[PDB]
Design a protein around this ligand. Structure first.
Ligand SMILES: N#CCc1ccc(-c2cccc3ccncc23)cc1
Ligand SMILES: N#CCc1ccc(-c2cccc3ccncc23)cc1
Lengths: 145, 146, 144
């Protein structure tokens, strides 16, 4: 099979940052897909499934409203045009402020027309809340249709 | 040299409804797959990957009893019945009432199935009044022959 | 007629408080060499595979302490029988008379597998599993 695919996971060695890596146990890059500057590089034109999941955790609810964001964006090689493909906002806290641990997952996915050389990023606003407790809760991937 | 495929997308102009479209970018319908009677028509017998995604948005949480469902069904050409292939239920609310915030909930379904020629697939939701087209974020239904 | 190893297993509605997978039943299947041994999918050949799973949790009202729901797909390597997580998720259905709640968990990805590898799809709270209707809980693979 010649189908361009990628399944990348968070690097535990770069805690405090969301750094994607093609880890030995459960991650990969195949059939031309590359991982450069924390981005997935598309080898050829066509429709692709782009999916992701990040998990936020904390202990108790502090001051004001904690806002959690997760965004998937595209950089086209032509005009270096950046566009938002998928995005979501979550507020984990609501009048707790005493403490008990909370969990907030963000999952995103969709089918998009990509061009050869396009770069995809999957970013978060609060890397300090990113959970590293288990092996495969935070991942980012592409599957050509 | 090519296999039957379909990637149909929901009509944003069909208010409070889930209406599928092939006549769009980037909607696909090839090698015998037909979009007929808001359903996908299987062109030949074999193994298929069936998948869908829907997005729900609610204005706030007046009660914790709000229930969201998304179901892919098979209407078999022979016996002519409606059987569930894939289904999911979600409760988007936990208390709230003070100001109310809009919520967003995606639902994903998909699997491999042995299908027969001429049988039909439907992808439905219980609350089409909650359906949304935001970036959280996509509404489609598709089949890929293996 | 496709030569690709594939599988689509569903939870047994007769296995109370257990998550026990069943095949070639209603719209379930095992094909082109995929086996079902000790509740795990046995990979028949080397290569890239699409792996996916869904589980549904139901509960009547929220009780004492915080309820945590988990769903995990694991890889047990043929050579050393080592068990590594491929995909995992955590959900909290309760946020502090009878009030039923519903929580679905869907996992999916692309993975390089070897011949002889075993795949499990497990949950922490089988007492909350909901298989009352048909396409509510499933596990499967498709070879690229
Ligand atoms: N080959 C290939 C491309 C590809 C891979 C996976 C899926 C898919 C599988 C199961 C569930 C889904 C839910 C939502 N969207 C997509 C889903 C669709 C297309
Ligand atoms: N068959 C097969 C493999 C597969 C199936 C479904 C998905 C998927 C689709 C849309 C959104 C997602 C968000 C988070 N994780 C997974 C998602 C990815 C891969």
């Amino acid at each position: 099979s010649d189908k361009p695919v990628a399944h990348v996971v968070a690097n535990p060695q770069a805690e405090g940052q969301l750094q994607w890596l093609n880890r030995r146990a459960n991650a990969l890059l195949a059939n031309g897909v590359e991982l450069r500057d924390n981005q997935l590089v598309v080898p050829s034109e066509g429709l692709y499934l782009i999916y992701s999941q990040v998990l936020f955790k904390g202990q108790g609810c502090p001051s004001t409203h904690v806002l959690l964001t997760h965004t998937i964006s595209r950089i086209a090689v032509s005009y270096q045009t950046k566009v938002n493909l998928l995005s979501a906002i979550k507020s984990p806290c609501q009048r707790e402020t005493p403490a008990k641990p909370w969990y907030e997952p963000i999952y995103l996915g969709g089918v998009f027309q990509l061009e050869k050389g396009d770069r995809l990023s999957a970013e978060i606003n609060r890397p300090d809340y990113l959970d590293f407790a288990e092996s495969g809760q935070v991942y980012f991937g592409i599957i050509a249709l």
